[PDB]
Amino acid sequence: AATTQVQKEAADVLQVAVQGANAMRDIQFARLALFHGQPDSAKKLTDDAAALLAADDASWAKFVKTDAKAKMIADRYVIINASIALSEDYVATPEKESAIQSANEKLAKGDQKGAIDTLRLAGIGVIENQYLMPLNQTRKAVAQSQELLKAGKYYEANLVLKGAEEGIVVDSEMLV
Amino acid sequence: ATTQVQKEAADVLQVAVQGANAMRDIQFARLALFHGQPDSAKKLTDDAAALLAADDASWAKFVKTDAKAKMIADRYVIINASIALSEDYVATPEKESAIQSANEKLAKGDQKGAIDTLRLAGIGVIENQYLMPLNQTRKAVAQSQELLKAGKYYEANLVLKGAEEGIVVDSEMLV
Amino acid sequence: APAAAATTQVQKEAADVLQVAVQGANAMRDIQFARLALFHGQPDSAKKLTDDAAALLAADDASWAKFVKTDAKAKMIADRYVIINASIALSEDYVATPEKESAIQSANEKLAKGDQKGAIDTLRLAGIGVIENQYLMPLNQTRKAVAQSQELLKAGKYYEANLVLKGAEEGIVVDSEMLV
Amino acid sequence: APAAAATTQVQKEAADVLQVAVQGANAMRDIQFARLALFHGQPDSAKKLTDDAAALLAADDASWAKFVKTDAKAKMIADRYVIINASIALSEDYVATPEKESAIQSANEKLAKGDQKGAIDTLRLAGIGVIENQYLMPLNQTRKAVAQSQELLKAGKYYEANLVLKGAEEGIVVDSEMLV
Numbered sequence: 001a002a003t004t005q006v007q008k009e010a011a012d013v014l015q016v017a018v019q020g021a022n023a024m025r026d027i028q029f030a031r032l033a034l035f036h037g038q039p040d041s042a043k044k045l046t047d048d049a050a051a052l053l054a055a056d057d058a059s060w061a062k063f064v065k066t067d068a069k070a071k072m073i074a075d076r077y078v079i080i081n082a083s084i085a086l087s088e089d090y091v092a093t094p095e096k097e098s099a100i101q102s103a104n105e106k107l108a109k110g111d112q113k114g115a116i117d118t119l120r121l122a123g124i125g126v127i128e129n130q131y132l133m134p135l136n137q138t139r140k141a142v143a144q145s146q147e148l149l150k151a152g153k154y155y156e157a158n159l160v161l162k163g164a165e166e167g168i169v170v171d172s173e174m175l176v
Numbered sequence: 177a178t179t180q181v182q183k184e185a186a187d188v189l190q191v192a193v194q195g196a197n198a199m200r201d202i203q204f205a206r207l208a209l210f211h212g213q214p215d216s217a218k219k220l221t222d223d224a225a226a227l228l229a230a231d232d233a234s235w236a237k238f239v240k241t242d243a244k245a246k247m248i249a250d251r252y253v254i255i256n257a258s259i260a261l262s263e264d265y266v267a268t269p270e271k272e273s274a275i276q277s278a279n280e281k282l283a284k285g286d287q288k289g290a291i292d293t294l295r296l297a298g299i300g301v302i303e304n305q306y307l308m309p310l311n312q313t314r315k316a317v318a319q320s321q322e323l324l325k326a327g328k329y330y331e332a333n334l335v336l337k338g339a340e341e342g343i344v345v346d347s348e349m350l351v
Numbered sequence: 352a353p354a355a356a357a358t359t360q361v362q363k364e365a366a367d368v369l370q371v372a373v374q375g376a377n378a379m380r381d382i383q384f385a386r387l388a389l390f391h392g393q394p395d396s397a398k399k400l401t402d403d404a405a406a407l408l409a410a411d412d413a414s415w416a417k418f419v420k421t422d423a424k425a426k427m428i429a430d431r432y433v434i435i436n437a438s439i440a441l442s443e444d445y446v447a448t449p450e451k452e453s454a455i456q457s458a459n460e461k462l463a464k465g466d467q468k469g470a471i472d473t474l475r476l477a478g479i480g481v482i483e484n485q486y487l488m489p490l491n492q493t494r495k496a497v498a499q500s501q502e503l504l505k506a507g508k509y510y511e512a513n514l515v516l517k518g519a520e521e522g523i524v525v526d527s528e529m530l531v
Numbered sequence: 532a533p534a535a536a537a538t539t540q541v542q543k544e545a546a547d548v549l550q551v552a553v554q555g556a557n558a559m560r561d562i563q564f565a566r567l568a569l570f571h572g573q574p575d576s577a578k579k580l581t582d583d584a585a586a587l588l589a590a591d592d593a594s595w596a597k598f599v600k601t602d603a604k605a606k607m608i609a610d611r612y613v614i615i616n617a618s619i620a621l622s623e624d625y626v627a628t629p630e631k632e633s634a635i636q637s638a639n640e641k642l643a644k645g646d647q648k649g650a651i652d653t654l655r656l657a658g659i660g661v662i663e664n665q666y667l668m669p670l671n672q673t674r675k676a677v678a679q680s681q682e683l684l685k686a687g688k689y690y691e692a693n694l695v696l697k698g699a700e701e702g703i704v705v706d707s708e709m710l711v
């Protein structure tokens with residue numbers, strides 16, 4: 001409950017659709033469930049993914065990467081997850097220490113660009129990995145999986161779900 | 177009802193989704209810091225600390241007893257897992273029959289029979305597992321909390337990065 | 352008689368026509384193995400591997416230029432990012448249908464004739480998605496990291512050299528692009 | 532002068548002492564590039580790469596033996612799983628302290644003498660974790676998948692060959708191991 005609220009608020013302000021991350025985790029767990037001979041669990045998980053994805057298009061809109069360049073199919077790609085990619089040499093120098101101090105202050109005060117620039121110029125690189133989900137295609141995949149599960153076609157449902165996981169596109173973007 | 181559905185499913189899969197959630201809190205905290213959202217980073221790291229503070233008895237259900245590799249002397253919890261699958265994707269009657277047989281076996285909860293049947297037909301299926309050192313992740317999160325309080329955001333980010341790097345990847349057969 | 356192994360030549364010729372600088376992938380694998388070697392108590396192997404990375408990266412800028420992603424949008428530092436590795440990302444539902452069977456045959460015939468766009472579009476319309484994952488290496492920063500690691504190794508600072516090399520690996524940016 | 536590149540030799544000699552079959556890594560990179568080539572409408576290149584993989588994998592069973600993980604626990608199929616690639620997994624907090632600095636110096640001294648165990652223990656007890664991620668390739672099954680792909684390519688079944696190769700790649704099992 002607490003975690004769910006905390007993650008939703010944080011993700012909302014990061015423009016990340018945690019609801020999509022959760023649908024994909026349901027999918028992941030469904031495939032696991034199948035191969036543990038837990039088809040009832042797999043149904044509950046796939047039905048939950050369906051329910052999450054069924055949130056209306058207007059609600060997904062603020063999370064859509066409208067300028068997404070690498071699409072596997074013509075769809076609206078939603079930023080469903082993201083993470084920090086970071087590189088430095090891990091050797092302390094006074095220039096780096098000063099740069100970190102400056103960047104910390106700038107982050108505390110909301111000067112994101114100044115923080116990132118300051119770190120960059122000191123040899124500390126930081127960007128965002130993004131995970132992009134095709135909204136209508138993933139909806140389709142989950143529905144197809146539901147039907148296969150109803151038919152007892154577990155292995156086949158597992159592969160449709162794998163397909164849905166393989167449709168998540170990885171991208172990188174600068175933080176600003 | 178996602179929280180409930182995931183908990184019930186993960187409990188019977190011997191996966192500590194509470195651990196996965198703590199790790200996602202950590203992941204989001206690092207993001208938050210670099211978007212100039214220190215109050216959010218605090219909320220997220222405090223939530224990670226709360227989840228991790230669950231008692232040792234509750235974590236024990238999910239502790240891996242056969243881990244061949246550990247970085248630190250600690251209890252490693254299976255906090256996440258996923259299916260690793262390999263086949264040739266060329267349909268044959270022999271494979272299709274094996275699949276039908278496996279499906280029948282899974283319907284009745286016969287995991288071993290299902291996995292053996294698929295393996296004999298050239299369809300491989302095992303588990304990837306993600307292992308979290310319990311006390312070391314507790315320690316890293318507390319350390320990060322203190323650094324955030326001190327305004328040492330970049331440093332807290334690296335402590336959290338180390339916590340993420342402490343997740344050990346493993347594989348195991350489904351049987 | 353089957354082709355004899357000629358891996359360096361085969362990869363180079365193939366990667367050149369794919370706009371992938373396999374020389375960069377080779378430099379990064381050297382780096383990877385150097386870190387492994389350090390933690391096996393093999394400093395000499397680590398030196399040889401890091402020196403090899405340095406030699407590969409020292410290839411002149413003109414030679415790297417055709418592999419630079421000049422429109423790279425996610426950069427950690429201001430640098431020339433080289434496409435050093437790439438792989439196929441593929442998604443389909445694995446359910447055969449007549450429409451997919453026909454589309455796959457058609458795509459195969461198009462690829463036979465080098466009609467990449469037609470093939471990818473045909474697969475796409477049948478629900479078969481295919482794009483490229485790319486691995487982008489900052490040329491000057493990686494040169495710098497490798498040189499720095501060489502100096503640390505000379506000083507016997509093996510753990511530190513390991514972390515510099517780790518940072519070099521962490522400098523590799525992951526991107527995706529449509530195949531056409 | 533600086534060491535000129537001799538990448539295949541340097542990688543082989545290092546991997547041999549590390550018990551990593553780089554020949555396997557090379558075959559898998561050939562397979563990866565072959566899939567890439569197919570989707571660029573380069574079937575001739577895909578053939579050369581797949582043929583090179585076949586040639587590398589055709590190395591005799593005796594030669595693969597020193598790299599077989601005899602006690603592999605997570606097999607997809609009954610096969611000899613070869614350690615074909617490995618990398619360092621490392622975790623620390625990146626906060627310098629006198630205790631960690633001392634431990635790092637001590638670890639470096641121990642690694643200088645080839646004392647892997649002492650070094651790794653020393654780091655571990657200072658809160659620096661270091662293990663190996665290993666990549667395990669089923670030898671017979673991978674040979675089989677490459678031959679099968681070769682036939683499909685001869686038949687112009689490019690998409691299908693791609694998926695057989697994808698399955699070969701999905702047959703690589705990832706494990707972790709203690710350095711020592």
Ligand SMILES: [Zn+2]
Binds near residue numbers: 094097
């Ligand atoms: Zn200083």
Ligand SMILES: [Zn+2]
Binds near residue numbers: 015128175211
């Ligand atoms: Zn962002």
Ligand SMILES: [Zn+2]
Binds near residue numbers: 189303
């Ligand atoms: Zn399990």
Ligand SMILES: [Zn+2]
Binds near residue numbers: 242348
């Ligand atoms: Zn076990």
Ligand SMILES: [Zn+2]
Binds near residue numbers: 276280
């Ligand atoms: Zn039957």
Ligand SMILES: [Zn+2]
Binds near residue numbers: 244346707
């Ligand atoms: Zn293991």
Ligand SMILES: [Zn+2]
Binds near residue numbers: 369370483530571
């Ligand atoms: Zn390309």
Ligand SMILES: [Zn+2]
Binds near residue numbers: 069171172424526527
């Ligand atoms: Zn991009």
Ligand SMILES: [Zn+2]
Binds near residue numbers: 628629632
């Ligand atoms: Zn000191």
Ligand SMILES: [Zn+2]
Binds near residue numbers: 391550663
């Ligand atoms: Zn080793």
